[PDB]
Design an enzyme around this catalytic site. Sequence first.
Site, PDB file in Angstrom:
ATOM      1  CD  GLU A 137      -2.906  -1.477   1.158  1.00 15.37           C
ATOM      2  OE1 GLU A 137      -3.414  -2.619   1.148  1.00 15.37           O
ATOM      3  OE2 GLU A 137      -3.530  -0.447   0.820  1.00 15.37           O
ATOM      4  N   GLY A 138       0.555   2.224  -0.798  1.00 17.50           N
ATOM      5  CA  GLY A 138       1.310   3.460  -0.831  1.00 17.50           C
ATOM      6  C   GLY A 138       0.528   4.571  -0.165  1.00 17.50           C
ATOM      7  N   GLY A 198      -2.293   5.101  -3.119  1.00 27.30           N
ATOM      8  CA  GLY A 198      -2.893   3.929  -3.729  1.00 27.30           C
ATOM      9  C   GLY A 198      -2.082   2.678  -3.473  1.00 27.30           C
ATOM     10  CD  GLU A 213      14.954   1.095 -10.393  1.00 28.59           C
ATOM     11  OE1 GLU A 213      14.703   2.318 -10.298  1.00 28.59           O
ATOM     12  OE2 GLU A 213      16.098   0.620 -10.224  1.00 28.59           O
ATOM     13  CG  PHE A 214      10.076  -5.331  -8.831  1.00 27.58           C
ATOM     14  CD1 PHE A 214       9.467  -5.064  -7.610  1.00 27.58           C
ATOM     15  CD2 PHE A 214      10.577  -6.607  -9.056  1.00 27.58           C
ATOM     16  CE1 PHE A 214       9.370  -6.046  -6.634  1.00 27.58           C
ATOM     17  CE2 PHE A 214      10.479  -7.590  -8.085  1.00 27.58           C
ATOM     18  CZ  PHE A 214       9.872  -7.307  -6.872  1.00 27.58           C
ATOM     19  CG  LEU A 215      13.764  -0.444  -5.846  1.00 25.25           C
ATOM     20  CD1 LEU A 215      15.243  -0.633  -6.138  1.00 25.25           C
ATOM     21  CD2 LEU A 215      13.050   0.156  -7.055  1.00 25.25           C
ATOM     22  CG  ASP A 238       5.826  10.250   3.778  1.00 25.54           C
ATOM     23  OD1 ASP A 238       5.910  10.358   5.018  1.00 25.54           O
ATOM     24  OD2 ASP A 238       5.075   9.422   3.222  1.00 25.54           O
TER      25      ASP A 238
HETATM   26  C1  LIG Z   1       5.859  -1.610  -1.974  1.00 22.38           C
HETATM   27  C2  LIG Z   1       5.886  -0.212  -2.548  1.00 22.38           C
HETATM   28  N1  LIG Z   1       5.126   0.741  -2.095  1.00 22.38           N
HETATM   29  C3  LIG Z   1       5.347   1.888  -2.780  1.00 22.38           C
HETATM   30  C4  LIG Z   1       4.802   3.175  -2.686  1.00 22.38           C
HETATM   31  C5  LIG Z   1       5.227   4.155  -3.526  1.00 22.38           C
HETATM   32  C6  LIG Z   1       6.208   3.897  -4.493  1.00 22.38           C
HETATM   33  C7  LIG Z   1       6.626   4.965  -5.355  1.00 22.38           C
HETATM   34  C8  LIG Z   1       6.961   5.841  -6.064  1.00 22.38           C
HETATM   35  C9  LIG Z   1       7.382   6.955  -6.935  1.00 22.38           C
HETATM   36  O1  LIG Z   1       6.991   8.208  -6.381  1.00 22.38           O
HETATM   37  C10 LIG Z   1       8.905   6.931  -7.029  1.00 22.38           C
HETATM   38  C11 LIG Z   1       9.379   8.117  -7.868  1.00 22.38           C
HETATM   39  C12 LIG Z   1       8.775   7.998  -9.264  1.00 22.38           C
HETATM   40  C13 LIG Z   1       7.247   8.008  -9.170  1.00 22.38           C
HETATM   41  C14 LIG Z   1       6.774   6.809  -8.343  1.00 22.38           C
HETATM   42  C15 LIG Z   1       6.756   2.618  -4.602  1.00 22.38           C
HETATM   43  C16 LIG Z   1       6.331   1.603  -3.746  1.00 22.38           C
HETATM   44  N2  LIG Z   1       6.662   0.257  -3.586  1.00 22.38           N
HETATM   45  C17 LIG Z   1       7.611  -0.437  -4.352  1.00 22.38           C
HETATM   46  N3  LIG Z   1       7.909  -0.027  -5.584  1.00 22.38           N
HETATM   47  C18 LIG Z   1       8.809  -0.665  -6.317  1.00 22.38           C
HETATM   48  N4  LIG Z   1       9.428  -1.730  -5.835  1.00 22.38           N
HETATM   49  C19 LIG Z   1       9.145  -2.152  -4.601  1.00 22.38           C
HETATM   50  N5  LIG Z   1       9.788  -3.261  -4.073  1.00 22.38           N
HETATM   51  N6  LIG Z   1       8.240  -1.502  -3.873  1.00 22.38           N
END
Ligand SMILES: Cc1nc2ccc(C#CC3(O)CCCCC3)cc2n1-c1ncnc(N)n1
Length: 291
Positions: free
Chosen positions: A31-32, A35, A98-100, A142
Site C-alpha cells: 500500500e502506498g 494507492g 522500476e521494481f526494487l 515523507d
Molecule cells: C511496496 C511499494 N510501495 C510503494 C509506494 C510508492 C512507491 C513509489 C513511487 C514513486 O513516487 C517513485 C518516484 C517515481 C514516481 C513513483 C513505490 C512503492 N513500492 C515499491 N515499488 C517498487 N518496488 C518495490 N519493491 N516496492
Amino acid sequence: GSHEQFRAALQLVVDPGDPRSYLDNFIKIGEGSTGIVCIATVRSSGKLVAVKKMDLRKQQRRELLFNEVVIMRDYQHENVVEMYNSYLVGDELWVVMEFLEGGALTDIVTHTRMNEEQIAAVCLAVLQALSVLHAQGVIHRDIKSDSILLTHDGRVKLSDFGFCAQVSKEVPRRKSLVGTPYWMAPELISRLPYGPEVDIWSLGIMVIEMVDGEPPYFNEPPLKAMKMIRDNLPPRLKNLHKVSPSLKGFLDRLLVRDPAQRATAAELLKHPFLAKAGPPASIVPLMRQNR
Ligand SMILES: Cc1nc2ccc(C#CC3(O)CCCCC3)cc2n1-c1ncnc(N)n1
C-alpha cells in the site's frame, strides 16, 4: 465537473492508452500513500515492473496526484526509483516503474540491528539523492524507512514521492501539513513556512529507526506525538550506549530544532561519519532471504 476536470488535466500529462494491454500477471505487493502497488510482467520483454495505482475518487488531496507525474516524470538518479510511464486507467492513475526486488528498509529495521557501516551506507545514498533533489527544489516530505527500497545486491533507492512539493527562486517554502506524524519536522507541525530542511530532520528520525527499531513517541497516538515533537527538545536515542560518538555527532547535526541551524544535504555529505559507509554488499546479509 471537478472530477472530470482533474481527469482531463491528468490526460494531458500521462502517456496515452491502456497499459493493461501490455502487462501480465498482477501481484499486489503493498500500500502506498495514495494507492496500492503491484508488480507485473511486460509481455514483450519478460521484464518485471512495479505499478502504483491511485484512485482519483479516493483522495483527500487529489491535487497531490500531479506531483509524481509532473515533478518526477523525467527524473533520473542512481538513488531514486526510476519512473517509466504513467497512464490514466478508468478512474485510476497508474505509474509504471522500476521494481526494487530487495523490499523496503522497514523490514530490516524491525527485524535486525544494523551496524554503523550499514547505517552510514544508507545515509550516504539518501543524502546524495537529497542533495540533487533539494538543489532542484524538490522536497520529498515523507522520508522514513518505508520510503527506502533496496536492490538484491544491497543498493539503496529513495521512493514514494506521493507527498512531494516544489519550491522555487520566486517561491521557496510550503505551509502544508504533509507527511507521517512521528517523522515530521517541528516547524512543520507548528504550521510554519518550511523548506527542504524538513527532509533532514526526517532523515534524523529515520536514523533513530535504524538504531532503536522505531521512531520517537511511536507508542503515542499520532496527534499526541506531533505535540510532543512540537513542544519538546530534540529526541534522544533509547540505545545511545550502543552508538559511537561519531554517529551521535552526525545525528546531532540533523535533529536541530532550528531549521536555519540544521545541516544541509550538501553539508552532511562531507561529514566524517559517512566515511564509515560500506559497499552495497554490506547490506545484503540484512535482507530477509539472507538472514
Ligand atoms: C511496496 C511499494 N510501495 C510503494 C509506494 C510508492 C512507491 C513509489 C513511487 C514513486 O513516487 C517513485 C518516484 C517515481 C514516481 C513513483 C513505490 C512503492 N513500492 C515499491 N515499488 C517498487 N518496488 C518495490 N519493491 N516496492
